[PDB]
């Protein structure tokens, strides 16, 4: 986006002041849409010395004469050319600026416009900057942040010591990564993305997107009337153990609820009988195991079962011991079908196997599993989209890094999912998503497309739960999937 601004100015020829005017008015319009008529509010505009602050001066100048009171607190030392120009206008228009504030200044105002720092934030916020931000955050006033809440790193979503908590953030051109990843996503409040006059071709060229309803809608496969179950693919799910008998059922139904034609589970006996007692639509093949866990002794039966399917999902509830590790790795090395690799199949995965596979793969770790997989800490991998991209590229796979915002990447293209809620923060929800991805691959979507549609629909289904989200369970999530699909179209 910095390149996008520079190109719009230097090559397309749009005066930087015009972009800044457009930025500022878009904030006024956004606030009006959120607050209704602005004429009865008193506005405190906090302006840094950069172009964020310059945007803020445009906001302030445009409210002059139209609202009850505007005051700018200018907190910078020096001003960029466009900030200075717009400060100049604010003042010729009759605007009041002050360069100091008392903790009490919030008293006589209703709305705080936060134009202190935008994408130009570098390093931790301290001193007067920090103290005014902590005062704003304690004030209970309505907070509207210009571009990004001040103190969020717009490339990562991290808080640089302290940050503004906004009710409304108005950003320009495109959402920034820091509105999408937490904690930044939380501090952004309601996000409006304003068109400020960039050529649409530049905006559309951005390589890291939010997954939207329209994107998912156009990816959902067709259901031609003259069809039969074979039209809609077959999935094999290799899952479960004597310890974890539930996982296979949740994964299997996840595939069925997204429209897959036939779903087969391979589960150790007698735990396989659990699935069909709950959902008799499922086929649940009993696997004879020595001690209740898959081992090399089941390799041949599983490859056999794989010949007649379009995709194999593996891992939920397998357990993690050496015999499972030997089985999972020899299987994936020999399987020449797309594989969805989850849970304990990730925990025992030899990543050398992924490189040598000619067939595709999607991996679906939560951060704990990703951390163990690449031998880093949870903190180093969580929301680390560049690490996810590198891993995907080096291992020729699609990586689905699960979290409140889920990252979906194949190393070239990266998508961010923002549907869902905390009802998915409960055992089983991951097992459902695994089935969904396998299901969509079986119906003919690419591994990346399948992952994109599934993470969106999985979160949206959770949002459709009628009671308090914390009581949502995986079984209820399954029931909500076809409603999510209907709402998508």
């Amino acid at each position: 986006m910095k390149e996008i601004d520079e190109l719009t100015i230097k090559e397309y020829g749009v005066d930087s002041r015009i972009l800044m005017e457009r930025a500022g008015i878009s904030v006024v319009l956004a606030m009006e849409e959120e607050l209704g008529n602005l004429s009865d509010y008193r506005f405190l505009v906090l302006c840094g010395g950069g172009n964020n602050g310059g945007d803020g001066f445009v906001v302030a100048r445009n409210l002059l004469g139209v609202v009850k009171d505007v005051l700018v607190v200018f907190l910078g030392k020096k001003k960029t050319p466009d900030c200075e120009y717009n400060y100049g206008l604010y003042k010729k228009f009759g605007g009041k600026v002050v360069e100091q504030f008392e903790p009490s200044i919030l008293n006589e105002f209703d709305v705080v416009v936060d134009a202190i720092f935008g994408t130009g934030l570098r390093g931790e916020i301290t001193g007067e900057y920090a103290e005014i931000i902590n005062l704003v955050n304690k004030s209970g006033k309505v907070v509207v942040s210009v571009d990004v809440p001040s103190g969020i790193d717009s490339n990562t979503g991290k808080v640089l010591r302290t940050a503004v908590k906004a009710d409304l953030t108005v950003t320009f051109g495109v959402p920034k990564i820091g509105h999408i990843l937490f904690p930044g996503r939380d501090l952004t409040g309601k996000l409006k993305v304003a068109n400020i006059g960039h050529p649409v071709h530049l905006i559309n060229s951005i390589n890291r997107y939010v997954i939207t309803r329209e994107m998912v809608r156009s990816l959902l496969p067709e259901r031609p009337r003259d069809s039969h179950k074979g039209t809609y693919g077959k999935v094999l799910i290799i899952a479960g153990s004597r310890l974890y008998s539930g996982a296979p059922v949740l994964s299997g139904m996840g595939s069925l609820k997204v429209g897959t034609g036939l779903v087969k589970l391979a589960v150790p006996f007698p735990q396989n009988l659990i699935a069909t007692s709950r959902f008799p639509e499922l086929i649940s093949v009993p696997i004879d195991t020595e001690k209740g866990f898959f081992s090399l002794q089941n390799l041949q039966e599983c490859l056999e079962l794989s010949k007649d399917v379009d995709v194999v999902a593996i891992g939920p509830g397998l357990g993690n011991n050496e015999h499972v590790r030997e089985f999972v790795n020899e299987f994936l090395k020999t399987l020449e079908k797309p594989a969805v690799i989850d849970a304990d199949a990730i925990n025992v995965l030899d990543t050398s196997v992924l490189k040598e596979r000619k067939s595709p793969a999607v991996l679906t770790p939560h951060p704990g599993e990703m951390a163990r997989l690449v031998k880093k800490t949870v903190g180093d991998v969580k929301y680390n989209y560049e690490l996810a991209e590198e891993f995907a590229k080096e291992n020729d796979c699609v990586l689905v890094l699960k979290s409140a915002t889920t990252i979906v990447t194949d190393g070239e293209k990266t998508l961010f999912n923002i549907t869902g809620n905390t009802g998915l923060s409960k055992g089983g929800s991951g097992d459902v998503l695994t089935g969904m991805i396998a299901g969509f691959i079986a119906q003919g979507l690419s591994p990346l497309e399948a992952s994109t549609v599934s993470v969106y629909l999985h979160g949206f289904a959770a949002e459709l739960f009628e009671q308090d989200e914390r009581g949502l369970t995986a079984s209820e999530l399954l029931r909500l999937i076809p409603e999510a699909i209907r709402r998508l179209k």
Partner: peptide
């Protein structure tokens, strides 16, 4: 739609 995306 012209000015804002949500």
């Amino acid at each position: 739609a012209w000015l804002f995306e949500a």
